[PDB]
Design a binder for this molecule. Structure first.
Ligand SMILES: CCc1nnc(NC(=O)[C@H]2CCCO2)s1
Ligand SMILES: CCc1nnc(NC(=O)[C@H]2CCCO2)s1
Lengths: 268, 269
């Protein structure tokens, strides 16, 4: 993998591994989300960022500032099969004072066809107090030299699926998965729970019958609070409709919300 | 990756991914175990076996027979870091009428140094009734043409760590992790729980303080029963011992039915 000719985006190819496929003989949504995170880290390293979960840059590290995700939106049209080669292109962009946006384009390396696309919103915050102090003009200069100056959006459509307000799930939930805990495989270098784990936990409340008759097409997820290593999560789901669902992840005890989102599934 | 010049073993290189590393800034033991399974699958495809995790041959598929693991033994001397290139060499061998043995050698592609090695015992079994059976002549001749004829062992030593009898953990356990469940990421094409998941569940009862002051050197695990998709596991551990050793036990919560038992040896950083 490497930065493109203009240095304003990053490309990388991946072969789909045998342990990365699920009950469809094709890659799982956690494999796809993991591959997005991998190409995002390699892009951050190729431009001088911190390589950890946050692409910190200088003066941000001086002020104990980190980039945290607020929203993840993934759309998949064709899940790659075992042995397939998938090319992913990622790029960074400034969203004024609110934060950053990271986009991805998934392609089949054989047919050159777009088989998926993703978008994410990142907010700036203090690593210790966790307060979203997204105020810094000189910090914006250190990352802008790596972003395309003209807008380049994976989902360009005016007021699309990635910019929709997600409501809160009313109790009782139609489907649920209680007692979900992270394991050592789900933790990073600083022992924080991987962003891809939350996606997998959201889908643990989808019934097996839906997974056996449908394929996941769209997933919009909002990150409200981070799940600690010793925390326990409850996954909630209700059919809002193709099939559509409303999701909610909360701490098993107090019922403190960590995530909320929507999923759209298609018949096979 | 490809079969070697003689066609009796398989080699493959892997770059360590960012999501594959843990608290040590190096690959997790589940990443290592996953890479062994990946090169094992590619070796099985390159010689004509099934790629569903059972390495099934023509006659085996006709009689509803599959290959299932009975023991896993992994030894790691240096965990690869993010961005490192690790070369793994795997090969199969017949163990008479008991079953098969699959071995691995892990090397750093830069220094050519051996940074790990693994061994596994595989028994033949009816896919449906789960009854183990002795390897017949028709089946044996179909897989022997892919195994080296002279013995090639990753752990050659006379009475090594990979052929030791593992005892059963007496209650109460010193450490424990209750309510472990598999997720959709842990299931294969036929919805069976991945063999690497059991290794991760065994290590969930090791205290965080041991993980923060030591690195896992050896792991011997025995597979007694398979955990179903809707099953829940209890992980048990007791210190048996610079180095630290433990005894492990995985069992179902609703009955205490054993699925795994093993030993782990850790060394100071
Ligand atoms: C879908 C899950 C994720 N996708 N991407 C992730 N992370 C990243 O791309 C890197 C670059 C920004 C800092 O972290 S998490
Ligand atoms: C450590 C976990 C595993 N290591 N290896 C595994 N599987 C394999 O190598 C292949 C060989 C044919 C059967 O499956 S499971």
């Amino acid at each position: 993998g490497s930065l493109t000719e203009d240095g304003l985006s990053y490309k990388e190819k991946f072969v789909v591994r045998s342990y990365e496929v699920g009950s469809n003989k094709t890659a799982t949504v956690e494999t796809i989300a993991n591959l997005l995170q991998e190409v995002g880290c390699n892009h951050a390293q190729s431009v001088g960022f911190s390589t950890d979960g946050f692409a910190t840059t200088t003066t941000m590290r001086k002020l104990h500032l980190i980039w945290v995700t607020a929203r993840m939106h993934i759309e998949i049209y064709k899940y790659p099969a075992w042995g397939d080669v998938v090319e992913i292109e990622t790029w960074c962009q400034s969203e004024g004072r609110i934060g950053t946006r990271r986009d991805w384009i998934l392609k089949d390396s054989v047919t050159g066809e777009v088989t998926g696309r993703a978008t994410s919103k990142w907010v700036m915050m203090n690593q210790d107090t966790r307060r979203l102090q997204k105020v810094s003009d000189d910090v914006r200069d250190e990352y802008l030299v790596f972003c395309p100056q003209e807008p380049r959006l994976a989902f360009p459509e005016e007021n699309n699926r990635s910019l929709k307000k997600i409501p809160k799930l009313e109790d009782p939930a139609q489907y649920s998965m209680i007692g979900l805990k992270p394991r050592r495989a789900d933790l990073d270098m600083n022992q924080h729970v991987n962003n891809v784990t939350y996606i997998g936990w959201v889908l643990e409340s989808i019934p097996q019958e839906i997974v056996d008759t449908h394929e996941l097409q769209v997933i919009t997820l909002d990150y409200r609070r981070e799940c600690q290593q010793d925390d326990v999560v409850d996954s909630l789901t209700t059919t809002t409709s193709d099939s559509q669902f409303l999701h909610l992840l909360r701490l098993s005890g107090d019922g403190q919300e960590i995530n909320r989102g929507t999923t759209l599934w298609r018949k096979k």
